[PDB]
Design a protein around this nucleic acid. Structure first.
Length: 344
RNA sequence: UGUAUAUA
């Protein structure tokens, strides 16, 4: 008979198990799927604040074994959730040596994010100082990107300055990160949480390779974030570049959502640019918008246009489209959205 | 009719 074995077989014990009852058996309970679930329930439900201190020192001394365990990491997280600063400082001091490794570990990175989510700034910088040694590799790792995201999300901009320095360290880093499946999220968090003096260099690097980023499966989300969290001059430059090349940007899988973001977030003169190019620029002897309506992707942009655009700019679209309606009805995407646009 | 977002 063993306390863990007895609890798994009969959780509803005659004397209901508390955390102080598993004293000396923390590691066995924490590494068990059912046992860890018990600690999570009591750490979240027990009104006796002193009950969690009976196992806490066992959690600290075995933190190097629990933070990267398939079940033990939930126990460590709950002490950041329901513990206080005295609990945080001891947990951080216990895991700080292998933070350069925990950031890349599937379960251990969850603990690091929860810590940055809950703890105070001095303890946040403690974890942040250990990320400095692996920041470049950590930024585009399958697990480490979520650690870098939470740091940008939860600590002051002047403390993530070394991350912005890493993104600008080389001429191509911003592009590589923008087209990376994990690194593109670090660029996104920076675009909405960093200071203007940090975002302005990064945004300027996005404009240096705007065309390659805008049609990238991940970089298009980066361009969309510059549209939403950028300055007035940033949307202007973006809306001019997409309007200068509307057809190719609307007829491609990923860059088509960029023009929808321009239409969703743009001012009147921004949409006037998009409408003017769609109506008055040609794609094979016929207006851009007419060829857009028979395209598999650009028809969504025409839908987005007609719904987000001024009624007067909508009249310019209607007059441009009307004489081409018999031509469009012969195309499957043309007849499809002509039906959804029969409203006009 | 068309895009990313991780643990039992």
């Amino acid at each position: 008979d063993d306390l863990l074995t007895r609890y798994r077989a009969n959780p509803a014990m005659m004397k209901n198990l508390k955390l102080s009852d598993i004293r000396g058996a923390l590691l066995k309970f924490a590494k068990d799927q059912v046992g860890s679930r018990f600690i999570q329930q009591e750490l979240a439900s027990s009104k006796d604040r002193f009950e969690k201190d009976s196992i806490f020192d066992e959690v600290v001394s075995n933190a190097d074994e629990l933070v990267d365990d398939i079940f033990g990491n939930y126990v460590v997280q709950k002490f950041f959730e329901y513990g206080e600063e005295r609990h945080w400082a001891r947990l951080v001091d216990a895991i700080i040596d292998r933070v350069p490794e925990y950031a890349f570990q599937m379960y251990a990175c969850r603990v690091l994010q929860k810590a940055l989510e809950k703890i105070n700034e001095p303890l946040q910088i403690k974890i942040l100082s250990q990320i400095r040694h692996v920041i470049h590799r950590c930024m585009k790792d399958q697990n480490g990107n979520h650690v870098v995201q939470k740091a940008i999300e939860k600590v002051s901009p002047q403390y993530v300055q070394f991350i912005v320095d890493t993104l600008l360290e080389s001429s191509n880093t911003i592009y590589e990160m923008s087209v990376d499946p994990y690194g593109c999220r670090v660029v996104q968090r920076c675009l909405e949480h960093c200071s203007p003096s940090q975002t302005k260099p990064v945004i300027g690097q996005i404009h240096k390779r705007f065309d390659e980023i805008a049609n990238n499966q991940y970089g298009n989300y980066v361009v969309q974030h510059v549209i939403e969290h950028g300055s007035e001059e940033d949307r202007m430059v973006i809306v001019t570049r997409v309007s200068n090349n509307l057809f190719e940007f609307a007829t491609h899988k990923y860059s088509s959502n960029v023009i929808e973001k321009c239409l969703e977030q743009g001012a009147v003169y921004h949409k006037s640019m998009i409408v003017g190019a769609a109506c008055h620029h040609q794609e094979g002897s016929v207006p851009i918008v007419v060829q857009m309506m028979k395209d598999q992707y650009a028809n969504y942009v025409v839908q987005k246009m007609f719904d987000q655009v001024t009624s007067e700019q909508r009249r310019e679209l209607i007059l441009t489209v009307r004489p081409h309606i018999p031509v469009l009805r012969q195309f499957p995407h043309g007849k499809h959205i002509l039906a959804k646009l029969e409203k006009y």
